[PDB]
């Protein structure tokens, strides 16, 4: 048999996931992002732009 429903699986779920709730805050996320001048479309082998943002912010924190 192909049992009926995706929802039946979701109902069968049991637990609260790791991070979803305590992580919540009022702060806007993109607002965290430093300015940095790296283009949008880096040359392959360069870090793509979004990586630089994460790294810089993590260093700052």
């Amino acid at each position: 048999v192909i049992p009926e429903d995706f929802q039946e699986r979701v109902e069968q779920q049991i637990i609260g996931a790791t991070t979803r709730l305590l992580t919540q805050t009022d702060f806007p996320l993109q607002s965290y992002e430093p300015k940095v001048q790296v283009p949008f479309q880096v040359l392959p082998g360069q870090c793509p732009r979004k990586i630089e943002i994460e790294r810089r912010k993590q260093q700052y924190l």
Partner: protein, 370 residues
């Protein structure tokens, strides 16, 4: 002996008459220390002015004086002149006739006010006024010319005939180096370099001086730039990040011909100049086609002479020898003209002077002057 001071809105230039170059150049900015009580405690002077103001640009207040080519505040401009005379020129202003320069069509009151402030406060015995294009044509060395002038805060075209400006054919266009920097900033932001701070904006200005150039056949140039990396030119920021610019280098200059990129609707500079000469009279049109001369900072861009030559010829009837001329020093050339003009001994006979200055006084800058 004589002094010459000039303001293409962007940067201002100070020089001794007859010299083949001005003795100092410094940028058109004033700044007051933000706590007056500290300043009076120090005795540190009223304002930083010229480049050291830039060196302190963050530590204090900064303001511009001559926006769109017009005096925004007299008191600031006189502080500029004070700094020029003492710090750059050192001379006693009382001892040396002095030349000051203005954009065209300056509202009449401003001429009188400017005269009054110079004569009464600065105490030189004699002074003269000139309209920038008129001095730049003097540097070119014609009485008979149509001038293109663009200092980074304004641009104009000016017909001048046997040494006079035919007023009605003058036009203003509010599209100048600042606007070009802002458009370039926008399009690099679309690349993702996102210059916004004053320091970065100055870096943009440097990029304009280093790497811009006009296209000829713009659509062909753009296509070839899209076709290949070979047009790329790279630059490294002061922080040591490398930035890479293609089509944008010529595309940014296009805005002069192509103001729809700015979303303003008056036709491009070539068109405006044609329409001006159309306001001038066929009697003199030929000589105007004969002497097209480029002035002020924006003319710095490579190749613009050829682009104008083509586009003017197209807009013109194909029945004259169009001749662009881009005298190498064209931005300084405005001041160079004044330097030679004041060098002319007969201009001493033109001098407006203290004795007249009592009775004939403020009005003669209208009545006697040109």
């Amino acid at each position: 002996t004589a002094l010459v001071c000039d303001n293409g809105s962007g940067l201002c230039k100070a020089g001794f008459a007859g010299d083949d170059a001005p003795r100092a150049v410094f940028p058109s900015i004033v700044g007051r220390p933000r706590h007056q009580g500290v300043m009076v405690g120090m005795g540190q002077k009223d304002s930083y002015v010229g480049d050291e103001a830039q060196s302190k640009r963050g530590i204090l207040t900064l303001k511009y004086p001559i926006e769109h080519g017009i005096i925004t505040n007299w008191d600031d401009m006189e502080k500029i002149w004070h700094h020029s005379f003492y710090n750059e020129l050192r001379v006693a202003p009382e001892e040396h006739p002095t030349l000051l320069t203005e954009a065209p069509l300056n509202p009449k009151a401003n001429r009188e006010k400017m005269t009054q402030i110079m004569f009464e406060t600065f105490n030189v015995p004699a002074m003269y006024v000139a309209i920038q294009a008129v001095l730049s044509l003097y540097a070119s060395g014609r009485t008979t010319g149509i001038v293109l002038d663009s200092g980074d805060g304004v641009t104009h075209n000016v017909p001048i005939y046997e040494g006079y400006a035919l007023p009605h054919a003058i036009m203003r266009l509010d599209l100048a180096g600042r606007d070009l920097t802002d458009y370039l900033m926008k399009i690099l932001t679309e690349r993702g370099y996102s210059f916004v701070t004053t320091a970065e904006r100055e870096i943009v200005r440097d990029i304009k001086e280093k790497l811009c150039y006009v296209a000829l056949d713009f659509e062909n140039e753009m296509a070839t730039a899209a076709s290949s990396s070979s047009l790329e030119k790279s630059y490294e920021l002061p922080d040591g990040q490398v930035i890479t610019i293609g089509n944008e280098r010529f595309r940014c200059p296009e805005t002069l011909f192509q103001p729809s990129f700015i979303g303003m609707e008056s036709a491009g500079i070539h068109e405006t100049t044609y329409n001006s000469i159309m306001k001038c009279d066929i009697d003199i049109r030929k000589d105007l086609y004969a002497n097209n001369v480029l002035s002020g900072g924006t003319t710095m861009y490579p190749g613009i002479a050829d682009r104008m030559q083509k586009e003017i010829t197209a807009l013109a009837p194909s029945t004259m020898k169009i001749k662009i001329i881009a005298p190498p020093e064209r931005k300084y050339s405005v001041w160079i003209g004044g330097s030679i003009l004041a060098s002319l001994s007969t201009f001493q006979q033109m001098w407006i002077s203290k004795q007249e200055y009592d009775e004939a006084g403020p009005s003669i800058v209208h009545r006697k002057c040109f």
